XYZ file of C-alpha atoms in Angstrom:
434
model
C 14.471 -16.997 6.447
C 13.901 -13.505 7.222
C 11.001 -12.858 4.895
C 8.233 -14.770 6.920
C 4.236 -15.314 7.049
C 4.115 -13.132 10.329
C 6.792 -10.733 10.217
C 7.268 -10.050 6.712
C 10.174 -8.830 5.084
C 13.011 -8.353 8.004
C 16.013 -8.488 5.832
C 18.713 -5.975 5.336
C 15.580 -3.842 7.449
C 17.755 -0.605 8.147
C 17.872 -0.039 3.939
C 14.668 -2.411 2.754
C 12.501 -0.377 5.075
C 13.307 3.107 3.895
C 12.178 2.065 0.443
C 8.593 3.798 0.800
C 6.061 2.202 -1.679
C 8.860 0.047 -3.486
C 9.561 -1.701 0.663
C 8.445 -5.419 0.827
C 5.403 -5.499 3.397
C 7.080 -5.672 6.876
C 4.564 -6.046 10.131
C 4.536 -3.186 12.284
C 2.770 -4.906 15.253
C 5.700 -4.517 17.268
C 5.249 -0.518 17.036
C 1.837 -0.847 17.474
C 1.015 0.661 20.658
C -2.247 -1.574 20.974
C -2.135 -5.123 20.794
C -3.146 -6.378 17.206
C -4.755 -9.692 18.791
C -8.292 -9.834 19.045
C -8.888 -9.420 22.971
C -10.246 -12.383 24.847
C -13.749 -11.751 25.032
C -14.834 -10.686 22.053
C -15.700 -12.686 18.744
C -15.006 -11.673 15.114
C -18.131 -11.198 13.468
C -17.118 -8.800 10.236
C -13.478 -9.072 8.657
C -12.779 -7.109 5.324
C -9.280 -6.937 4.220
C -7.882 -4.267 1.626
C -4.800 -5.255 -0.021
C -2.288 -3.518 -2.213
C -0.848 -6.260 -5.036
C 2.881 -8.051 -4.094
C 5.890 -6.411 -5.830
C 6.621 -5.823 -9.008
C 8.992 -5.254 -12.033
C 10.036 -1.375 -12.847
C 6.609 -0.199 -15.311
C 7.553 -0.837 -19.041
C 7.978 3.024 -19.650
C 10.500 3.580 -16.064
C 12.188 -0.274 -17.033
C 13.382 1.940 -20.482
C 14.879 4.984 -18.538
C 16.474 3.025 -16.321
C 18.075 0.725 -18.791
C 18.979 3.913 -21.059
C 20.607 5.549 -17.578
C 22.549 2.712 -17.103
C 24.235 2.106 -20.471
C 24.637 5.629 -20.399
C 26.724 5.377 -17.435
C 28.424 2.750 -18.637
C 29.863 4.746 -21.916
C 30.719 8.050 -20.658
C 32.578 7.015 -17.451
C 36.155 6.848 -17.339
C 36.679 4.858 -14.317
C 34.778 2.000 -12.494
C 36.762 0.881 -9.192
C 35.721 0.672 -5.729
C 31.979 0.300 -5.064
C 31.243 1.598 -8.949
C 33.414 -1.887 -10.490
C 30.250 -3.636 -10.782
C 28.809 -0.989 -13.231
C 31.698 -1.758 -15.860
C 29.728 -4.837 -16.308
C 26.234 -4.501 -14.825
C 23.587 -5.831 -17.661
C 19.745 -4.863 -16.981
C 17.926 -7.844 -17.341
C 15.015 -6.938 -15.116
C 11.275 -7.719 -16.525
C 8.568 -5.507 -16.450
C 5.220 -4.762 -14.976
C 4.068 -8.062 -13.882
C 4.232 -9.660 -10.376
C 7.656 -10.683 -9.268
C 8.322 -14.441 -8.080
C 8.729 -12.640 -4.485
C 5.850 -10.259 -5.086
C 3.427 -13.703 -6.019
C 5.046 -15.297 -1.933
C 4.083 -12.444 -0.310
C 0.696 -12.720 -1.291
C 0.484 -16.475 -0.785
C 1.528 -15.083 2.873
C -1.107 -12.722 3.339
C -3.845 -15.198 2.195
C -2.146 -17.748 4.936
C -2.524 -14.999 7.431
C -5.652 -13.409 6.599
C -7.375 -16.955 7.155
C -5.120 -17.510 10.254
C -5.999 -14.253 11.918
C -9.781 -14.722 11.567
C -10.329 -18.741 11.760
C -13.689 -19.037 13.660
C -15.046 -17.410 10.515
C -12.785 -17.819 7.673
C -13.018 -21.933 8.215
C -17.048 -22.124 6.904
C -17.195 -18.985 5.099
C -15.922 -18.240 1.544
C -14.910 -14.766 1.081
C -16.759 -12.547 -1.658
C -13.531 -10.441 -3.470
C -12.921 -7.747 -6.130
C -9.830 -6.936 -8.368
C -9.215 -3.970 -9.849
C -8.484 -4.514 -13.615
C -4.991 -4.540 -13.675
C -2.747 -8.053 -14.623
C -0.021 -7.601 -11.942
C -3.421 -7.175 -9.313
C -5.598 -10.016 -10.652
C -2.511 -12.344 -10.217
C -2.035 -10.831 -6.269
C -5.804 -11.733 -5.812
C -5.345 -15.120 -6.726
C -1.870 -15.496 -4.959
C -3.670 -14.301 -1.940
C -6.900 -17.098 -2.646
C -3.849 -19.799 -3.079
C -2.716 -19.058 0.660
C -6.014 -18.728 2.158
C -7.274 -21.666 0.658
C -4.456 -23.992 0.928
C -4.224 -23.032 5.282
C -8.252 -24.191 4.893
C -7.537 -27.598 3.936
C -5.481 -28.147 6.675
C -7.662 -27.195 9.127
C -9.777 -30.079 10.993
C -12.844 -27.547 11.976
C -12.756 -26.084 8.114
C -16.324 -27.254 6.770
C -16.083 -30.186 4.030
C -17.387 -29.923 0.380
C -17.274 -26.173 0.620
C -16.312 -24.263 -2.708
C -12.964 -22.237 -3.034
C -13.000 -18.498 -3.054
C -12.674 -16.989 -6.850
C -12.434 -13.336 -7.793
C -16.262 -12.686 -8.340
C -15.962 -9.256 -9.939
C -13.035 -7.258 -11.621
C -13.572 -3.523 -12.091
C -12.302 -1.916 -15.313
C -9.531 0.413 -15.683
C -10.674 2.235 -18.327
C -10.277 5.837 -18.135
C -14.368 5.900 -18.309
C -15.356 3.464 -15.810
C -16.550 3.809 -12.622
C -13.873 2.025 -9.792
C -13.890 2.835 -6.264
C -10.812 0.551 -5.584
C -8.923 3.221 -8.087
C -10.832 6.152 -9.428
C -9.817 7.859 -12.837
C -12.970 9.845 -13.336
C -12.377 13.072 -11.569
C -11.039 15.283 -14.069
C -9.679 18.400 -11.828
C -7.817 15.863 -9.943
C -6.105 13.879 -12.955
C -4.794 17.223 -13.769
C -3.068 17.943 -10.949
C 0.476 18.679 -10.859
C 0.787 19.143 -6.923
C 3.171 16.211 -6.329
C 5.659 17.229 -9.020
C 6.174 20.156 -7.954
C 6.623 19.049 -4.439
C 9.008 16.113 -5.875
C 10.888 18.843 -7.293
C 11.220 21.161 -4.242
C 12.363 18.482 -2.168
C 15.074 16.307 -4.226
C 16.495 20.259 -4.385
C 17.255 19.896 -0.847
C 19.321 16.660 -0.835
C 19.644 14.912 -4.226
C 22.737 17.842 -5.683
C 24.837 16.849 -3.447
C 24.735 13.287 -4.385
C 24.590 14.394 -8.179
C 28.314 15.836 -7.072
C 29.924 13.349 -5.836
C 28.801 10.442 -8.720
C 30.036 12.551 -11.445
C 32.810 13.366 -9.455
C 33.645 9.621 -9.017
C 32.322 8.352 -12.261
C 34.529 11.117 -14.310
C 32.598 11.586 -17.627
C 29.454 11.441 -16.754
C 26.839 14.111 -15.984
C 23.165 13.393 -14.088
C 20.498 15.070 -14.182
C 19.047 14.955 -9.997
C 16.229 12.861 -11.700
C 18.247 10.486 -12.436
C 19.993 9.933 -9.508
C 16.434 9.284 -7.549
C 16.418 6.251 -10.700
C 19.729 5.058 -9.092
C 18.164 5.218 -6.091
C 14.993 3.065 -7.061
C 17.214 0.664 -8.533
C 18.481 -0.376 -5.138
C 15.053 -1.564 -4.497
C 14.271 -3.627 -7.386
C 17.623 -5.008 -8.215
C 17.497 -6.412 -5.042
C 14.014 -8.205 -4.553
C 13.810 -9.093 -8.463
C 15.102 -12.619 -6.828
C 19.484 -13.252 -0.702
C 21.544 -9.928 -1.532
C 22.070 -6.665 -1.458
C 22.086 -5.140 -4.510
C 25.285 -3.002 -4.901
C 23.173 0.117 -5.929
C 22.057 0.502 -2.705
C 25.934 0.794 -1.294
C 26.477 3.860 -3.633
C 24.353 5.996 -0.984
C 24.726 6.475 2.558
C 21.716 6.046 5.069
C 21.406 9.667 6.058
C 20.424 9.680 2.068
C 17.987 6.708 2.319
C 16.553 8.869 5.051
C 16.088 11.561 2.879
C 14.452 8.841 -0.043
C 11.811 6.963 1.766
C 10.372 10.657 2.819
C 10.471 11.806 -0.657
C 8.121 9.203 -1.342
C 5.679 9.822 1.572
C 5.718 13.246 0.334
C 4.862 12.005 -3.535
C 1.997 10.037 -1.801
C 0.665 12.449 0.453
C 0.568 15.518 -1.858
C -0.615 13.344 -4.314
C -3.301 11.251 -3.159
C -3.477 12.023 0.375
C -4.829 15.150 2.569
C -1.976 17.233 0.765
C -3.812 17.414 -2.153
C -7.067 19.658 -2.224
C -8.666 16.390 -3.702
C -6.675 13.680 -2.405
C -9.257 12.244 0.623
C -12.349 12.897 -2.261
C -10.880 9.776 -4.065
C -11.583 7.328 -1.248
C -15.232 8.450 -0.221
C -16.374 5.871 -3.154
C -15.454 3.145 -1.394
C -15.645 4.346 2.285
C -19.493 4.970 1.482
C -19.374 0.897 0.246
C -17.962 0.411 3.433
C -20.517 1.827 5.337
C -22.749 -0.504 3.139
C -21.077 -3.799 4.601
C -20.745 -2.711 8.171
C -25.008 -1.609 8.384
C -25.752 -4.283 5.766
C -27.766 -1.633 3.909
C -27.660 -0.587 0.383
C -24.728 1.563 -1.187
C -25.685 5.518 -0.797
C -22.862 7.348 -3.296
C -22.927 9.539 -6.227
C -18.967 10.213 -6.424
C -16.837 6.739 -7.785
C -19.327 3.752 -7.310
C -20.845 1.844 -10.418
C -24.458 2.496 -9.565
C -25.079 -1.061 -11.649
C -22.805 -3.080 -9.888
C -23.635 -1.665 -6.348
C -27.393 -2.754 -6.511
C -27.308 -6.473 -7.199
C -26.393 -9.242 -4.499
C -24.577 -11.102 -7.330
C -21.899 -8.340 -7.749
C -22.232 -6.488 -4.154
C -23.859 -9.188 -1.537
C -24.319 -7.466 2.018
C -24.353 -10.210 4.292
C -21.268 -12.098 3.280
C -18.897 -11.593 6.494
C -15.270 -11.827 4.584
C -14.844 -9.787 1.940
C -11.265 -8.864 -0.093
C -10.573 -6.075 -2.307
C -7.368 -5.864 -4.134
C -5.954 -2.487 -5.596
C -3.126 0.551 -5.969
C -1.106 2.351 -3.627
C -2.819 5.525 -4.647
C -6.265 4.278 -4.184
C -5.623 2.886 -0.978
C -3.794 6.437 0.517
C -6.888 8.082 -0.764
C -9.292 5.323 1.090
C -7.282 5.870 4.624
C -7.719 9.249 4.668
C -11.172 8.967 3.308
C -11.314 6.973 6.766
C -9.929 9.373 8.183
C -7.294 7.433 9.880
C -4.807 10.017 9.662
C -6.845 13.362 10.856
C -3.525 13.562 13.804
C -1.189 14.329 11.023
C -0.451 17.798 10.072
C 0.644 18.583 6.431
C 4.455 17.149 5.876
C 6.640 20.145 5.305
C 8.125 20.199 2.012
C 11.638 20.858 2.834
C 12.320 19.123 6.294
C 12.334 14.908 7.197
C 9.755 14.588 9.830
C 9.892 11.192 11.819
C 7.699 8.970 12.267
C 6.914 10.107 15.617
C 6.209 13.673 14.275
C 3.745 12.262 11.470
C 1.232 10.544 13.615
C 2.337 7.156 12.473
C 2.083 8.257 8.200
C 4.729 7.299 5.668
C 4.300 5.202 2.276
C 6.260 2.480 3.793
C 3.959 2.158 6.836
C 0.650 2.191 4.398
C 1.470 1.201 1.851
C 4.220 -1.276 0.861
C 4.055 -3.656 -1.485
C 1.328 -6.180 -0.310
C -0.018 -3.914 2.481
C -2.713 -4.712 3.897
C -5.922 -2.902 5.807
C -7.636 -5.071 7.838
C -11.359 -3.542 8.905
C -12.908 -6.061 11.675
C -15.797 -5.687 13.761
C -16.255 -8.021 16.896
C -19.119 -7.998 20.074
C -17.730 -8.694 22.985
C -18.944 -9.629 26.519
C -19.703 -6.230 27.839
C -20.748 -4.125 25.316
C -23.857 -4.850 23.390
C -23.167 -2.789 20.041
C -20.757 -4.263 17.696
C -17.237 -2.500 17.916
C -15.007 -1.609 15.026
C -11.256 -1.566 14.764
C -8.602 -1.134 11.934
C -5.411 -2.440 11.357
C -3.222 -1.046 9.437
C -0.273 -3.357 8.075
C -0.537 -5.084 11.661
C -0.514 -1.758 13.376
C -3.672 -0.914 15.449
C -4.438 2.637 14.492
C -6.871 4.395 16.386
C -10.343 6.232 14.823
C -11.043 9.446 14.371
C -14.446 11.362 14.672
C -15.639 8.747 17.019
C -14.872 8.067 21.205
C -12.211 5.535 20.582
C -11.779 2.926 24.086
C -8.427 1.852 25.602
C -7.902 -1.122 22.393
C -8.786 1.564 19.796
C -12.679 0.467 18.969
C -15.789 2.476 18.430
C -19.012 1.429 18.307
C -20.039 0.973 14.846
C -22.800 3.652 14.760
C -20.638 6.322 16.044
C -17.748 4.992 13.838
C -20.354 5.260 10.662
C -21.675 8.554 12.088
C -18.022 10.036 12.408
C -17.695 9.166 8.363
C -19.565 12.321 7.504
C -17.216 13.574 5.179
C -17.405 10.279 2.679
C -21.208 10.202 3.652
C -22.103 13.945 2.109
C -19.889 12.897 -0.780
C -16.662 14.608 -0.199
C -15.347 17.504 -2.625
C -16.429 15.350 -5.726
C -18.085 18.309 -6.782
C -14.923 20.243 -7.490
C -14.315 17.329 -9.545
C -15.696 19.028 -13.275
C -16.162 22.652 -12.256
């Protein structure tokens, strides 16, 4: 009841929210200064949608520490009572990796919405969609084809006979392919140890004092301020791995959760975003397949594409109209600033919270949640004889950069593709081996 198709996740919203990547999707067109609807006028005539998979169990290698923390905790302490009784008897029986039961709804949701949001094309057009090669993102692709499909058949205007949508290509995760959804082949940048040492300045300022007062209360124990954070991530998925709160998440106070959800805007934005010297570079891959969809014209890229699979219709049509990707948080951060969607956002300090307000509307929890979603439409409307583009971020209208943006946040799409000229001269990929 207060995880819906529309909204999203609304429960328990002053703790879920400050989750960063590990929040459930929640819509943020209520803070959208725009209006997210598609003004009267105009007609949808492109719709891509790039969506982060649903959420997950801890990864197989974090699932260990956590489990090793815990029964840790659980033999050294002296005494559990108050809010630290349940961890006499707490037993970690979370899964790992895959989708969650939740993670596979919200999904389901998004396909329901997606086809919802854009029926005068989505009810006679099947949608042409990628995966990245990862299990818990193949089974969010098909989630997402069970919701869009399943809104189709009920719809009287939705064309008879017509096949379902599939996923028509999955791109490899090998450390040697070629993936513009989530690139692994720039070397400089899969050496870089920018966000750990930005985790580490940060937790410095906030995370000791927290380490104090558990082994103060949990006599016996000692933490390390790394593992606190785990504590701290095990609000999260003790609490969506099924109506409750888990009763991690009472152990810290919301001036703390404050603290949390910006130490993971901070892990994304040093690490894949403009804070890192190579961050954008990741996304220009598939921002320059972008500007192959938009103009209809062949893919011009030397940086993440698979030449191969870029110049056949079979595995990269042009003229479909819906198209779906599905992929990573860290591709996706890399992609929006590729896009650069987030040029009004000035480097995050590194030892002071900055709002919301202060950030230009950038946080892991606004981009990407679980199941986020980037919705890139274009529509031709009435008055204006070029097509106009617009992009939604997680329901939020956010408005372009490097192109003269109008009072509902469009630009035509030649000026939009002309403002790309970062992605289009190939970004730093250079830097990449030398």
């Amino acid at each position: 009841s207060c995880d819906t198709v529309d909204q999203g996740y609304q429960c328990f919203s002053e703790t879920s929210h400050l989750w960063g990547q590990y929040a459930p999707f929640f819509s943020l067109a209520n803070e959208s200064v725009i209006s997210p609807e598609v003004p009267a006028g105009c007609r949808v005539t492109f719709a891509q949608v790039l969506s982060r998979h649903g959420a997950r169990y801890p990864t197989d290698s974090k699932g260990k520490k956590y489990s090793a923390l815990i029964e840790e905790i659980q033999q050294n302490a002296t005494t559990f009572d108050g809010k630290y009784a349940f961890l006499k008897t707490y037993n970690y029986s979370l899964g790992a990796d895959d989708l969650t039961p939740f993670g596979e709804q919200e999904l389901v949701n998004s396909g329901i919405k997606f086809y919802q949001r854009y029926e005068s094309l989505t009810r006679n057009i099947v949608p042409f969609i990628r995966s990245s090669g990862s299990s818990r993102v193949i089974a969010s692709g098909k989630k997402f084809i069970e919701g869009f499909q399943s809104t189709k058949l009920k719809d009287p205007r939705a064309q008879p006979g017509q096949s379902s949508p599939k996923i028509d290509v999955v791109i490899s995760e090998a450390s040697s392919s070629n993936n513009t959804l989530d690139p692994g082949t720039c070397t400089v940048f899969e050496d870089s140890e920018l966000a750990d040492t930005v985790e580490a300045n940060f937790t410095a300022t906030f995370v000791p004092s927290i380490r104090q007062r558990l082994e103060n209360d949990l006599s016996g124990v000692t933490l390390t301020d790394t593992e606190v954070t785990y504590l701290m991530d095990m609000c999260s998925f003790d609490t969506i791995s099924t109506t409750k709160l888990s009763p991690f998440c009472d152990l810290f106070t919301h001036d703390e959760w404050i603290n949390y959800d910006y130490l993971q805007s901070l892990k994304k934005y040093y690490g894949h975003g403009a804070g890192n010297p190579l961050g954008p570079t990741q996304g220009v891959g598939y921002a320059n397949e972008l500007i192959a969809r938009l103009t209809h014209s062949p893919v011009h890229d030397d940086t993440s594409s698979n030449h191969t699979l870029d110049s056949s219709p079979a595995t990269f049509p042009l003229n479909s109209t819906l198209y779906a990707d599905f992929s990573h948080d860290n591709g996706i951060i890399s992609i929006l600033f590729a896009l650069g969607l987030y040029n009004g956002t000035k480097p995050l300090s590194t030892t002071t919270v900055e709002n919301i307000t202060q950030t230009d509307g950038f946080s892991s929890a606004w981009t990407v949640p679980f199941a986020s979603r980037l919705y890139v439409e274009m529509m031709q409307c009435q008055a204006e004889q070029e097509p106009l583009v617009r992009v939604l971020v997680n329901d939020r209208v956010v408005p372009l950069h490097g192109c003269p943006v109008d009072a509902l946040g469009r630009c035509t799409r030649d000026s939009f593709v002309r403002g790309l000229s970062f992605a289009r001269s190939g970004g730093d990929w250079a830097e990449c081996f030398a």
